[PDB]
Amino acid sequence: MITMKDIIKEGHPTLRKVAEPVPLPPSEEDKRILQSLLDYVKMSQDPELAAKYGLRPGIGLAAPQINVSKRMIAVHVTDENGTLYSYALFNPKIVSHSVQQCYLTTGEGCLSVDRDVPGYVLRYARITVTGTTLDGEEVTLRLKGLPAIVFQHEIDHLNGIMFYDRINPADPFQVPDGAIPIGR
Ligand SMILES: CCCCC[C@H](CC(=O)NO)C(=O)N[C@H](C(=O)N1CCC[C@H]1CO)C(C)C
Numbered sequence: 001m002i003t004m005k006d007i008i009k010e011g012h013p014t015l016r017k018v019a020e021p022v023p024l025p026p027s028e029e030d031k032r033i034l035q036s037l038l039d040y041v042k043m044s045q046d047p048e049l050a051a052k053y054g055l056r057p058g059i060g061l062a063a064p065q066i067n068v069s070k071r072m073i074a075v076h077v078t079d080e081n082g083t084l085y086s087y088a089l090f091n092p093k094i095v096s097h098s099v100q101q102c103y104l105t106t107g108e109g110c111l112s113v114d115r116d117v118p119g120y121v122l123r124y125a126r127i128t129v130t131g132t133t134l135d136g137e138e139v140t141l142r143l144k145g146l147p148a149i150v151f152q153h154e155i156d157h158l159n160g161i162m163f164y165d166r167i168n169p170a171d172p173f174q175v176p177d178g179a180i181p182i183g184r
């Protein structure tokens with residue numbers, strides 16, 4: 001049961017480290033931690049539960065954000081067609097992606113970053129991710145759009161990368177030729 005007081009903030013060294021892979025089959029404690037990421041993402045999205053326990057809504061979360069330097073991520077997001085993508089994975093990795101990029105026109109926010117950081121965060125429009133689930137299933141997920149963006153954001157945390165690292169340092173709102181802007 002993670003709450004905002006368990007979330008570390010930008011500046012904490014753990015957020016810039018490369019997380020350690022998780023030995024499989026997982027220990028009961030590593031399963032507990034991964035499950036806890038997924039439960040926080042789901043719960044943070046019920047505004048009543050968020051207010052009750054002091055959570056901030058997130059559509060994804062990575063172990064390093066609660067100061068656990070291990071390769072674990074959770075994702076719970078609905079795409080533009082109304083389809084839910086809910087996952088809790090050990091050792092996720094993007095094995096291939098599109099050359100074409102996309103980005104949210106609103107920019108991105110991070111639970112560990114307490115301040116408006118303006119600008120487009122460039123992401124691949126399509127990706128393929130492998131990982132192992134809480135029940136030992138090895139999955140290969142072909143994702144696009146917002147779900148693909150969320151996976152890139154959480155996997156980035158496991159490599160010590162923050163979203164603003166992918167914002168153009170010269171003109172944050174540079175419009176990339178051919179890139180898909182996402183935002184209605
Ligand atoms: C989009 C990629 C980032 C998704 C994950 C983050 C939460 C996080 O820091 N995970 O490590 C989030 O929910 N960010 C939210 C976010 O950026 N929103 C959520 C809906 C889509 C986008 C707003 O444009 C903010 C509002 C807290």
Ligand code: NI
Nearest residue numbers: 094095096097
């Ligand atoms: Ni590549």
Ligand code: NI
Nearest residue numbers: 110111112153
């Ligand atoms: Ni984040």
